[PDB]
């Protein structure tokens, strides 16, 4: 009777950037999605495809736990059929996505006084994200004809970029934790259910 | 040779339509940030459109549903698709290379644009 | 939408003097402001990105700072190349528009 890992997904002390956003892999497990439904700051627990409620009720074969680190200015585009810089180059999430997007704002968590320069976010990209892609390449970005060689300069430039949260910022650009859970059902036995 | 050259601008009467071009050089176009920022006689200067290297547009809400921006990879060129023209949109027009945090680093030298019947 | 307030409108300043300019923004928008230099007949010239980073290229004598809401671009000693309109921009995505301030036109004090 093992309960699934979702304590370690959502109390975990540290995030990782939204580049290299962390995927917990959730199997052969008893899930309670009690704790989540009516949390203190949960700014937003929009589902997809799917309905909480119903949620107890349905096995799935997989269940991933996406997490990382946005501002709140790009919470909107943690969804289906979404375009902007996270969207494309950092975190996309497919057309048909069946699951639930959940976002707080963790300003007195990833905010350092000074600026909070650990957590990254992809600028440059030369197309766009398939959905549940991840990009961890560090390559210098070629924007002009000459080529680049490893050569941080102009018209190549380092394809990464900090957020610097500060905890006096605006709420738009404080961080906010982001916890994708994707449910998966397909040629599989299911083994995720609820109780 | 780092340059960005308008063209394609003109009279035009309202309603009608005109496309502007935006020859790259140095500066790859489907690599950037592209943007087309106007600056009518006297005023300040306006963003209209921008189109990411990765496809993403976006348009001010002046010029949605009237503008479309564009581009042809193999000509290393930038368009701006201008239907359904009205007297306000009489301005000078720059594309630009963006940078996002960068700053506008690139400008063009400008083509203009008047609508009037 | 996010309002860039300038000010002044204009200022008259002498060859060597040290000029300041404002920008205020309706709402944060943290270090994602730009100062840009356009002299009439021209386009644009980018001076600071970053709200304090110096363009390559750009004279030392010009420099950016602030964060959050209240923005000032500095000439320190003002050169005769220097007599143009300053802009600032809000260059952030969201909310989109890329707004510019309204502009300081710098003439020359006599």
């Known amino acids: 009777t093992n309960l699934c890992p979702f304590d370690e997904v959502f109390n975990a002390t540290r995030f990782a950037s939204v580049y290299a956003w962390n995927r917990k892999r959730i199997s052969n497990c008893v899930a309670d999605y009690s704790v989540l439904y009516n949390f203190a700051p949960f700014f937003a627990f929009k589902c997809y495809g799917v309905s909480p409620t119903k949620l107890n009720d349905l096995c799935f074969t997989n269940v991933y736990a996406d997490s990382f680190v946005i501002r709140g200015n790009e919470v909107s585009q943690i969804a289906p059929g979404q375009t902007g810089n996270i969207a494309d180059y950092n975190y996309k999430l497919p057309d048909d996505f069946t699951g639930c997007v959940i976002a707080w704002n963790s300003n007195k968590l990833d905010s350092k006084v000074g600026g909070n320069y650990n957590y990254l976010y992809r600028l440059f990209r030369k197309s766009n994200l398939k959905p549940f892609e991840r990009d961890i390449s560090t390559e210098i970005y070629q924007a002009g004809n000459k080529p680049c060689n490893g050569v941080a300069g102009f018209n190549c430039y380092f394809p990464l970029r900090s957020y610097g949260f500060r905890p006096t910022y605006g709420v738009g650009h404080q961080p906010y934790r982001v916890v994708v859970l994707s449910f998966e059902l397909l040629h599989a036995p299911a083994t995720v259910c609820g109780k | 040779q780092v340059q960005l050259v308008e063209s394609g601008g003109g009279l035009i009467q309202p309603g009608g339509s005109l496309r502007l071009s935006c020859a790259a050089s140095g500066v790859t176009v489907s690599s950037n940030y592209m943007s087309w920022v106007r600056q009518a006689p006297g005023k300040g200067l306006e963003w209209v459109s921008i189109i990411y290297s990765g496809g993403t547009t976006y348009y001010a809400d002046s010029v949605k549903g009237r503008f479309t921006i564009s581009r042809d990879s193999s000509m290393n060129t930038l368009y701006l698709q201008m239907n359904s023209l009205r007297a306000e949109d009489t301005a000078v027009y720059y594309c630009?290379?963006?940078?996002?945090?960068?700053?506008?680093?690139?400008w063009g030298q400008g083509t203009t644009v008047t609508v009037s019947s | 939408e996010i309002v860039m307030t300038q000010s002044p409108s204009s200022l008259s300043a002498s060859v060597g003097d040290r000029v300041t300019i404002t920008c205020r923004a309706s709402q944060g928008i943290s270090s994602y402001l730009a100062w840009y230099q356009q002299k009439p007949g021209k386009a644009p010239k980018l001076l600071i990105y970053?709200?304090?980073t110096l363009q390559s290229g750009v004279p030392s004598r010009f420099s950016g700072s602030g964060s959050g809401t209240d923005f000032t671009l500095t000439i320190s000693s003002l050169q005769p190349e220097d007599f143009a309109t300053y802009y600032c921009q809000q260059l952030d995505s969201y909310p989109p528009g890329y707004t510019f301030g309204q502009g300081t036109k710098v003439d020359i004090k006599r």
């Open positions: 630009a290379r963006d940078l996002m945090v960068y700053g506008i680093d690139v």
């Open positions: 970053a709200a304090s």
